[PDB]
Amino acid sequence: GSSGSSGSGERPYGCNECGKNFGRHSHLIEHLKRHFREKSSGPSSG
Ligand SMILES: [Zn+2]
């Protein structure tokens, strides 16, 4: 038969804030840096 039908790997670290995945612990951390850092998404205040 056919199972998985995929050839990439495993991505346990799946960010929720936006919905990103990774294959390492750090990869996720560094990624989260963006969300935390209020630069792109933010209220209307200058
Ligand atoms: Zn994310």
Side-chain angles (χ1 to χ4, degrees):
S2 296
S3 294
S5 66
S6 64
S8 273
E10 278 193 317
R11 285 176 188 73
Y13 304 95
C15 162
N16 297 309
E17 292 284 311
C18 69
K20 210 90 280 191
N21 271 127
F22 310 95
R24 271 208 199 190
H25 169 72
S26 305
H27 280 201
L28 175 68
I29 301 301
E30 282 304 82
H31 159 70
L32 285 160
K33 305 295 210 74
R34 280 192 83 196
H35 309 333
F36 184 54
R37 286 270 150 167
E38 195 192 44
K39 191 75 81 151
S40 191
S41 183
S44 303
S45 198

